[PDB]
Enzyme design. Sequence first.
Site, PDB file in Angstrom:
ATOM      1  N   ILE A   1      36.809  35.938  37.806  1.00 27.34           N
ATOM      2  CA  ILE A   1      37.546  34.865  36.994  1.00 27.34           C
ATOM      3  C   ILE A   1      36.671  34.737  35.770  1.00 27.34           C
ATOM      4  O   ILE A   1      36.856  33.423  35.216  1.00 27.34           O
ATOM      5  CB  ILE A   1      37.810  33.673  37.756  1.00 27.34           C
TER       6      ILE A   1
ATOM      7  N   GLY B   1      30.062  37.837  31.564  1.00 26.19           N
ATOM      8  CA  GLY B   1      28.900  37.411  30.651  1.00 26.19           C
ATOM      9  C   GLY B   1      28.024  38.517  30.404  1.00 26.19           C
ATOM     10  O   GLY B   1      28.076  39.532  31.123  1.00 26.19           O
ATOM     11  N   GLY B   2      26.883  38.362  29.648  1.00 25.05           N
ATOM     12  CA  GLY B   2      25.831  39.175  29.532  1.00 25.05           C
ATOM     13  C   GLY B   2      25.025  39.670  30.810  1.00 25.05           C
ATOM     14  O   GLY B   2      24.850  40.885  30.898  1.00 25.05           O
ATOM     15  N   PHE B   3      24.939  38.785  31.546  1.00 28.75           N
ATOM     16  CA  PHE B   3      23.908  39.063  32.574  1.00 28.75           C
ATOM     17  C   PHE B   3      24.766  39.313  34.264  1.00 28.75           C
ATOM     18  O   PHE B   3      24.301  39.763  34.887  1.00 28.75           O
ATOM     19  CB  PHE B   3      22.802  37.790  32.808  1.00 28.75           C
ATOM     20  N   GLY B   4      26.088  38.936  33.965  1.00 30.01           N
ATOM     21  CA  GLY B   4      26.821  39.149  35.289  1.00 30.01           C
ATOM     22  C   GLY B   4      28.200  38.408  35.085  1.00 30.01           C
ATOM     23  O   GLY B   4      28.927  38.402  34.033  1.00 30.01           O
ATOM     24  N   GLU B   5      28.756  37.982  36.254  1.00 25.55           N
ATOM     25  CA  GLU B   5      30.269  37.567  36.217  1.00 25.55           C
ATOM     26  C   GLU B   5      30.321  36.454  37.280  1.00 25.55           C
ATOM     27  O   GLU B   5      29.507  36.151  37.901  1.00 25.55           O
ATOM     28  CB  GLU B   5      31.101  38.975  36.694  1.00 25.55           C
ATOM     29  N   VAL B   6      31.606  35.868  37.252  1.00 27.89           N
ATOM     30  CA  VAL B   6      31.912  34.881  37.825  1.00 27.89           C
ATOM     31  C   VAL B   6      33.108  35.169  38.800  1.00 27.89           C
ATOM     32  O   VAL B   6      34.017  35.663  38.459  1.00 27.89           O
ATOM     33  CB  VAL B   6      32.455  33.585  37.180  1.00 27.89           C
TER      34      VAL B   6
ATOM     35  N   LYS C   1      29.102  32.019  40.325  1.00 21.28           N
ATOM     36  CA  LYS C   1      28.338  32.756  39.235  1.00 21.28           C
ATOM     37  C   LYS C   1      27.185  33.767  39.654  1.00 21.28           C
ATOM     38  O   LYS C   1      25.990  33.141  39.715  1.00 21.28           O
ATOM     39  CB  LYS C   1      27.939  31.658  38.125  1.00 21.28           C
TER      40      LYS C   1
ATOM     41  N   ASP D   1      26.468  24.409  22.668  1.00 19.32           N
ATOM     42  CA  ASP D   1      27.457  25.257  22.585  1.00 19.32           C
ATOM     43  C   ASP D   1      28.872  24.889  22.903  1.00 19.32           C
ATOM     44  O   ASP D   1      29.765  25.530  23.200  1.00 19.32           O
ATOM     45  CB  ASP D   1      26.977  26.306  23.666  1.00 19.32           C
TER      46      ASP D   1
END
Length: 414
Positions: free
Chosen positions: A86, A89-94, A109, A206
């Site tokens: 769902i 991102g740059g280092f991984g996912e959720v 996350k 941000d």
Amino acid sequence: KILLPEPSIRSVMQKYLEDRGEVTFEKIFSQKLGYLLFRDFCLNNLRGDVFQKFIESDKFTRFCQWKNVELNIHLTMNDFSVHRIIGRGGFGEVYGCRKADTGKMYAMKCLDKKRIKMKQGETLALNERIMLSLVSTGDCPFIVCMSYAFHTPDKLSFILDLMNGGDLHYHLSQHGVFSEADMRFYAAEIILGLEHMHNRFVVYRDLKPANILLDEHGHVRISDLGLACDFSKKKPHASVGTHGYMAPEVLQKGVAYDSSADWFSLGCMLFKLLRGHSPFRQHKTKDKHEIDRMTLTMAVELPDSFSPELRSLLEGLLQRDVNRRLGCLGRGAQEVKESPFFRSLDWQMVFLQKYPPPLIPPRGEVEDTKGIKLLDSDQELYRNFPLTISERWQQEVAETVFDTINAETDRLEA
Ligand SMILES: Cn1c(CNc2cccc(C(=O)NCc3ccccc3C(F)(F)F)c2)nnc1-c1ccncc1
């Protein structure tokens, strides 16, 4: 499933808690499970007389049993049923997941350590963990907060509030721009989110539509604290954030700033909800230097269609000097809440999420690392990454298995 330890754990757990001065009215009554078992006992001046009679009773024995479970939490992937992605991102996912023992739904996350190492992002990943822990007490419903952190041989995991409704960047692309009335709903909830952060000396930095997530009813939360910092210790001076949503203090190289940066960003974002671009974009130019100079030099240019109340708010939020800007003059977030734009809002009812949201989400549809080793040195950087928020685990237990397990355990012990 949660199995409480046998009630002969009582004497050892009582010595553990007494040695840490945690067997008092203030410490136990303030805890949620402590409150419920004390509440349960009373139906069967309070700082002395009543409290010690509770300590002798086996409702305190039960509190010691639940506490023992709390202190031995050591989560792994095995303790969650992970379903579908769902977020990315740059280092991984959720992922959406269910915690096995309580059945509570969360967002997981999952950041990949090899992708972190490769991009030298160790301090960023640790920072989100630190920032989340600062903001994740007080059960604020307008920030995506953390309940647990843990890591595995190859992954970092944050266990966050689940948000199934998608973000306002996505929804802008479907819905189109919002009216003033509809924008006001999002502003009111976002303002309360920022107030909670600013109280704990966190500047968020941000703020933009992509970081405002929706639940299935359409209430929103500020998500992703990766670029936030604790401004009390040293005021940040780096240009952090998204071009078009950064304050003049942030852009000016050398200049220190605090929470002031967020209120400018709020101005940029609320305008974006109404008009489809940042107020310092002009002709959808992808020239980032043109966007920044328009922010720094030229005063904000509003269209005539905006109501006089909305002009007051935006001009106030987008004052280039911190000494003229709404939410920076003394009283903080309360200055923004008192704006004519929010004349008709009861901020207790905003907090209680009583106002109808203007968008109820519809239904969704359904490598790099090769080469990088993970040394002992790398695992040492995440030694203190594991964490549990007491409030959160207790609230989870209270709303799911507390009564059931308490009843089950009474049969085993009777
Ligand atoms: C949509 N969403 C995001 C968006 N950000 C995100 C997602 C997945 C991975 C990453 C990521 O790899 N972040 C790395 C990063 C990037 C910039 C600054 C710090 C950091 C970090 F702290 F993660 F190292 C970010 N984060 N959490 C959610 C989410 C939360 C609850 N429910 C649904 C979704």
